[PDB]
Design a protein around this ligand. Structure first.
Ligand SMILES: C/C(=C\Cc1c(O)c(Cl)c(C)c(C=O)c1O)CC/C=C(\C)[C@H](C)O
Ligand SMILES: C/C(=C\Cc1c(O)c(Cl)c(C)c(C=O)c1O)CC/C=C(\C)[C@H](C)O
Ligand SMILES: [Fe+3]
Ligand SMILES: [Fe+3]
Ligand SMILES: [Fe+3]
Ligand SMILES: [Fe+3]
Ligand SMILES: [O-]
Ligand SMILES: [O-]
Lengths: 266, 265
């Protein structure tokens, strides 16, 4: 269908159409949407992959070290579970889950560009992750819109974590791939916790008007609940878990410059 | 069957030796869909410098071109096919950079500020994947020397850092610079097409590479000329797209909706 041809290609600008384009939520993201079956991802589960040497271990300790600081500073520990404290958590953390796949994608892109070699499907995997995690932010910001302290600390988090991820990937992209491996091992835990807690009525959900952004992106029928939204977000993290653990492994074996195994499922 | 059982496995390393190399996976699934006789009337345009920033973006490129052409010897002697491919190989390394840094910075901005991005990221990201496909194509038709492989490495560094600070200081200027660059590219890519029609240039690569034939949806009959003709249209999509995006900045419209994402749907 698209009416994009040479009369449009010889234009100077389309600045003028800008005021008459609708803001339909589906545009927020590309069409590489994830498609999960609620009854199948329902049985997603908590795994843990053994660290192989020093770098796998450094990686695993840092994620533990961070889970522990975060969990304590943020008071997630004592008090009952709450809607408020779940989404506030997911909101802040989702800002930093978006970074990794954009540094890997972006650097593997640049490498492809300077030794003029073929990437074999790695770049388009990482950037859909980055995107897919950015859409995790976009959903929770429909649910809780935070205030000035939490926002200022999100900005300093990105400054710090952009710098670490960036310079970690240049020196050991296995490290960073291992690190998201384990990062997501914790993401999966935290979310099955939230579903379990709904199922045992300890956190019975108030936000069931699932946002339009999330309905389009996960193709969810109108009658979907917070628990159904959460699960799918948890299913996404199990994928990333396997992808960054498969990617780390591949490096360990010196298979960086080999086909991205997840291209086949497509 | 991509479900829990696959998501609950730890690693898919054992699958690497059983997955085959396919040209269709070297990019995403967002491919140019051109029809040759339509895109034969792409054309050289020039946007008016609207103000001090544009004038600076334009005068940078014009000097980059003058310098590069006297230093590369483009104009010295006759057009040859080695001289065209040499050049476009060099330059198409540089060209993949801008969309990526742009795409990245905007991604980053939606995360820290928690704001809709409204279609820019992807367009700016497939824009980088496109230029890299041009590049993967040109690596098939020539494999450059050691001298040039070094010249290409160091030039990434200067250019990467340049756009990094440029896009943080002023995205208006970058998009314009990019818009202007892609005027010049269409000029070159028409000089070439015209050189073929005249017989001043007789390509020998009128076997077009596999990567390119499924990236662009061409036939095994299509030639060098036809390849230069789908690429040129890519360079004119980035010409408009980018001059529009930079008009959106000049007007404080850089957080409205990217208009092209309707111009598809
Ligand atoms: C391992 C951690 C939390 C588990 C966890 C979650 O519980 C959730 Cl809910 C998500 C989304 C993720 C996403 O990765 C996630 O990693 C602590 C990470 C702390 C930092 C990175 C510091 C503050 O910079
Ligand atoms: C020669 C130049 C421009 C013409 C031109 C072309 O002739 C071509 Cl063939 C293309 C593809 C493009 C793509 O954008 C292109 O811009 C100068 C480019 C900049 C440098 C060399 C240094 C890094 O600053
Ligand atoms: Fe994650
Ligand atoms: Fe996430
Ligand atoms: Fe190009
Ligand atoms: Fe270009
Ligand atoms: O996440
Ligand atoms: O280019």
């Amino acid at each position: 269908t698209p009416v994009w041809g040479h009369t449009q290609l010889n234009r100077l600008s389309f600045l003028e159409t800008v005021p008459v384009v609708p803001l339909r939520v589906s545009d927020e993201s590309s069409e590489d949407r994830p498609t999960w079956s609620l009854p199948d991802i329902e049985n997603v589960a908590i795994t843990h992959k053994k660290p192989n040497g020093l770098v796998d271990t450094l990686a695993y300790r840092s994620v533990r070290t961070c889970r522990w600081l975060f969990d304590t500073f943020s008071l997630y520990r004592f008090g009952s579970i709450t809607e408020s404290k779940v989404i506030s958590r997911c909101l802040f953390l989702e800002t930093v889950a978006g970074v990794p796949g954009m540094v890997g994608g972006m650097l593997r892109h640049l490498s492809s560009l300077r030794y003029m070699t073929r990437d074999k499907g790695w770049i388009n995997t990482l950037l859909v992750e980055a995107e897919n995690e950015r859409m995790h932010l976009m959903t929770f910001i429909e649910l809780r819109q935070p205030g000035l302290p939490l926002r200022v600390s999100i900005i300093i988090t990105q400054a710090i974590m952009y710098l670490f991820l960036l310079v970690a990937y240049v020196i050991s992209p296995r490290f960073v791939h291992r690190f998201v491996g384990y990062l997501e091992e914790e993401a999966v835990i935290t979310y099955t916790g939230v579903m379990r807690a709904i199922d045992e009525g300890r956190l019975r959900p108030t936000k069931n008007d699932v946002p339009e952004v999330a309905r389009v992106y996960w193709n969810l029928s109108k009658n979907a609940t917070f628990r159904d939204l959460i699960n799918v977000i948890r299913a996404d993290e199990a994928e990333h878990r396997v992808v960054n653990h498969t990617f780390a492994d591949m490096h360990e074996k010196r298979l960086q410059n080999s086909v991205n195994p997840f291209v086949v499922l497509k």
